[PDB]
């Protein structure tokens, strides 16, 4: 049996069989050209790989920073797909339990490296928008496109899913919303004869005590999902690359993601001036699209097959990891380094997170779906996108 | 098959058969006295028709403005019933699909003409209270009286409804609540070093971009309700007036509604002083009672018959039209004329709209009902009515 | 048939049969030593009864106030259990209907006497925290420990409850939340050119008009629960003490609770300084633990027996009585005496009450349970406890 993310990781794989240059005339370079054809050429997004050496040469030549920022997003779009592919090529050699533990802590690898490299460069605002923008993308854009495109193709058939597997995710997202609401309400307590230095050290001290509780709720979620109630999770039912070759490519792709994520962070303020876009719009709308490349194109294919237990397991499972594992890990790392970071996102950002959890919880509680459920979730994503397009706050 | 509003439009009809003055001694004036008896005398609210010529004569004689405002509400109470009756006397000559399109854009005719005539006379506050007061009336007063009066008469029987027909309405009302919450939160961003002229042009510019998205969500709702999923809407199953006579009375009643709606708008500030009532209380409590005259007395009769699919189709269907067709149409008309109008209702008004959608969504999600569900919705309407009675804000 | 609280009141009873000192050698003092062994020694919390005469002697000797406050909480912990035991020893002599009326108005006896004795001593803040802390304790701590400890012991069996008996409680808690939200939003209307004396008399005047509506919704709840829909409430199925002996002990225990509740109120400000704890933390966390002694240890035992209709009837039934009978009764008593008290708890307290009702309503709407539902409700209680531990607001 496979997990819900093993099924959806091989959705953009293209079978590449040259068998003319490599197979027949060669005798010695047979294994080296087989690993290279499988990993590099073996995808549907292989036209974006020349954007990786283009951004490195433009860095060491002196091209202006809006050109580097444009090419370093097209480079990370196939790299986030290969890392989310080579991990499931290790799950055949490790098993569905241990493979589900490497997938639960390294599923969102691009959203994790950006949120740390922007944290160490004192850009705490860019950390907060990109982590919020990855929760709203999975709840509204990835989930809305699945129920709308899979609801027009299957308009004459019957569409059902299991409620009990997806209700655990909305319980944890409401525990995470409480950890964002309460630092926001402390900052509106200025009537209590306390200065600005008193209210700011209270927001920082409760946000660091909340992050320990949020990590305990995610460790217990993994025991639920992998061992105690596995029976409703492996209801979905071979590796090509050898193990020690697949371990070497995974270290190689991670250093190139961590290299191109430095170009995104260092060239985001000047790319905002020359494009006349706010820094809040680029970080919350455009930048989470790079990470959700194979999850977004893997939950839609399993909606045309009317398997809506896989579309919900990818969309809701990746938003619980951002909200309760990647957000409270950033607070603990800032606790060690000594950087003032709390769970206060803002009044306009908390109100968008509140409605997005409530409208998703009412949509998915009868166990059936049609195309009108998936359109309301799309149009709520454009309302959020118009609001941060206009909000050019200097 | 009929719609849910065809069944509930003929609920206040009284059969008037004189057959002494008209039928026997006359020979020539037979058709003219038959249309006049059917339309004018053929209702249960025919004692309120002398209030229409009384308000016109008191206008041209010089009677003080609190007398004109009292009589111009009693005049519009049978006129809103005749327009909501003569349209369904055109649905027998047009069909259930085309007749459902004329009913979906002209169902709330009194709330539409008041909201435009008050807009062109620079009374933007009276527009915002009367459109909010028509959503809260349908969700709490019309829906609460149905489930309470139909839950005492049927206390020994079993009361059920179809959830899937009514869940589409609560998805759109949560999309509409997001378009009211976000202009409210921009006005609390005064910490971002922006003046009052900067925050006010941001509220106006996002409210005009939201209104295009709100109209697209209602056009797709009509395709859902009339053509794709008609099968759950015509589950409910002859015209008297000729077609070209019924078209002539519909133009005549609309001009008299548009005449008496001018008297309501022009005499609402002095009627507030002489009665010692706030302008917010008259517009949000008393004034939506005039429009919901046949919907309120048509959803209760079909609760004594234990047909709760018709009580929900009238109450929830008329609150989606106000919230997503009549509210965003007023923003587009003010965009053309050049009147500064946004979707900001206020902090006390948005908090009442938020709880009224949540408590109605939890009440109607098991598919059954009893009298205790309908009493909580009534007592939440009196809590809102006490709050705006005391709030006399100069 | 018994109620849901008759079953859970005798959960801490210990059978005490000496039969050596009393029974054999004595002939005259047989009935007096039988009532004394049944009431005093007949419990599992009988080691805390020496804390009652210790707090009285330390009062009349001159011991410092942090010592009296510590002993007067250990005294009230078995006294709240005996009063919640001797009332059900009167229900066998009165019946399940009249006995359910004495239990519905005297179930929370310790939270009622503290909220009045602190009201008459001008400590209105201590009244508002202890009444909020008894709603949050029953929804999160009592209900979360039941579903977690009864979900590990019954992990191989099937856990179900009846939704329709518990959905009435969440309808009334949302009617009560609206009565707390609207006085909070009037205090943020400072832009309307009104002074501080105008906004404060508007909060007081609507809070006294809301309390009449909240009491009418609870009287109708008792008619629902006891007479009209009793059939779903007595689905659960002998007294030892004579009636006129049990009436005499009930008057005696009430005067000692009302005596030790004076020591808690008079020694709470100096016990806050010498312990370096805020007055908000003691009143909202530590002090409601004293009242929920037999309800908390009576809903867990019936979760090991897989009878989750009794665990929900005790937890949710005691939070509706606090929120809609004990909170609006305190406003009416302050209306008579002339003490300025409204339903404004505060911005940080209203946001905790809002999320606690929503996360409890989504958890209990499929009719089944497991251990992961009960852990999220526990960890939401610690997030609230960390927030008021740090909030030391002078």
From Swiss-Prot, chains A, B, C:
Effects seen without this gene: Plants exhibit a 50% reduction in tonoplast Ca(2+)/H(+) exchange activity, a 40% reduction in tonoplast V-type H(+)-translocating ATPase activity, a 36% increase in tonoplast Ca(2+)-ATPase activity and an increased expression of CAX3 and CAX4. These plants exhibit altered plant development, perturbed hormone sensitivities, altered auxin signaling response, lower sensitivity to other metal ions and increased freezing tolerance after cold acclimation.
Gene Ontology terms describing biological process: calcium ion transport; cold acclimation; intracellular calcium ion homeostasis; intracellular manganese ion homeostasis; intracellular zinc ion homeostasis; lithium ion transport; monoatomic cation transport; phosphate ion homeostasis
Entry-linked Gene3D superfamilies: NCX, central ion-binding region
Cytoplasmic side: 87-97, 153-167, 305-318, 364-369
Notes on activation and inhibition: Activated by monothiol glutaredoxin GRXS14 and CXIP4. Inhibited by excess of Ca(2+) and Cd(2+), Na(+) and K(+), but not Mn(2+).
Tissues where this protein is expressed: Expressed at low levels in leaves, stems and flowers.
Region (Required for Ca(2+)/H(+) exchange activity): 57-65
Applied uses, from the record: CAX1 expression in tomato increases calcium content and prolonges shelf life and may serve as an alternative to the application of CaCl(2) used to extend shelf life in numerous agricultural commodities. Expression in potato tubers increases calcium content by 3-fold without the adverse effect of increasing other metal ion contents.
UniProt keyword terms in alphabetical order: Acetylation, Antiport, Calcium, Calcium transport, Glycoprotein, Ion transport, Membrane, Transmembrane, Transmembrane helix, Transport, Vacuole
UniProt pH dependence: Optimum pH is 7.5 for cytosolic pH.
Gene Ontology CC terms, in alphabetical order: calcium:proton antiporter complex; plant-type vacuole; plant-type vacuole membrane; vacuole
Transmembrane domains' residue ranges: 39-59, 67-86, 98-118, 132-152, 168-188, 209-229, 240-260, 284-304, 319-339, 343-363, 370-390
Glycosylation sites: 276
Keyword Oxidoreductase: no
Region named Cation selection: 107-142, 291-326
Compartment(s) of residence: Vacuole membrane
Main location: membrane
Subunit and interaction comment: Interacts with GRXS14 and CXIP4.
Family as reported in the entry's similarity comment: Belongs to the Ca(2+):cation antiporter (CaCA) (TC 2.A.19) family. Cation/proton exchanger (CAX) subfamily.
Name the record gives this protein: Vacuolar cation/proton exchanger 1
Species in which this protein is naturally found: Arabidopsis thaliana (Mouse-ear cress)
Gene transcribed to yield this protein: CAX1
């Amino acid at each position: 049996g496979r997990t819900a993310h093993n099924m959806s990781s091989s959705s953009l794989r293209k079978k590449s069989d040259l068998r003319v240059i490599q197979k027949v005339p060669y005798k010695g370079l047979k294994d080296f050209l087989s690993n290279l054809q499988e990993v590099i050429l073996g995808t549907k997004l292989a036209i974006l790989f020349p954007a990786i050496p283009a951004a490195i040469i433009c860095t060491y030549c002196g091209v202006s920073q809006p050109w580097i920022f444009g090419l370093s997003l097209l480079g990370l779009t196939p790299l986030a797909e290969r890392v989310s592919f080579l991990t499931e090529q290790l799950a055949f050699y490790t098993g569905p339990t241990l493979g589900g533990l490497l997938n639960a802590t390294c599923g969102n690898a691009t959203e994790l490296i950006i949120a740390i490299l922007a944290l160490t460069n004192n850009k705490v605002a860019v950390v907060k928008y990109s982590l919020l923008g990855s929760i709203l993308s999975n709840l509204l854009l990835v989930l809305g496109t699945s129920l709308f495109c899979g609801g027009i193709a299957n308009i004459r058939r019957e569409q059902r899913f299991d409620r009990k597997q997806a209700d655990v995710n909305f319980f944890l997202l409401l525990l995470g919303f409480l950890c964002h609401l309460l630092p926001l309400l402390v900052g509106y307590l200025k009537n209590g004869e306390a200065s600005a230095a008193v209210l700011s050290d209270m927001q920082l001290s409760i946000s660091r005590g909340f992050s320990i509780v949020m990590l305990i709720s995610y460790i217990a979620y993994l025991v639920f999902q992998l061992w105690t109630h596995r029976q409703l999770f492996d209801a979905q039912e071979t590796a090509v690359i050898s193990f020690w070759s697949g371990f070497a490519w995974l270290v190689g792709m991670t250093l190139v993601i961590a290299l191109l994520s430095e170009y995104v962070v260092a060239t985001i303020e000047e790319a905002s001036d020359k494009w006349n876009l706010s820094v809040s719009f680029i970080s919350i709308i455009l930048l989470p699209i790079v990470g959700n490349a194979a999850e977004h194109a893997g939950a839609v294919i399993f909606a045309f097959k009317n398997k809506l237990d896989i579309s919900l397991g990818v969309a809701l499972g990746s938003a619980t990891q951002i909200g309760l594992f990647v957000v409270p890990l950033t607070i603990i790392v800032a606790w060690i380094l000594g950087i003032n970071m709390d769970l206060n996102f803002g009044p306009l950002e908390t109100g968008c997170l509140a409605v997005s959890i409530i409208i998703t919880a009412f949509t998915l509680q009868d166990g059936s779906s049609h195309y009108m459920k998936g359109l309301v979730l799309l149009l709520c994503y454009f309302i959020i996108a118009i609001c941060f397009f206009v909000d050019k706050l200097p």
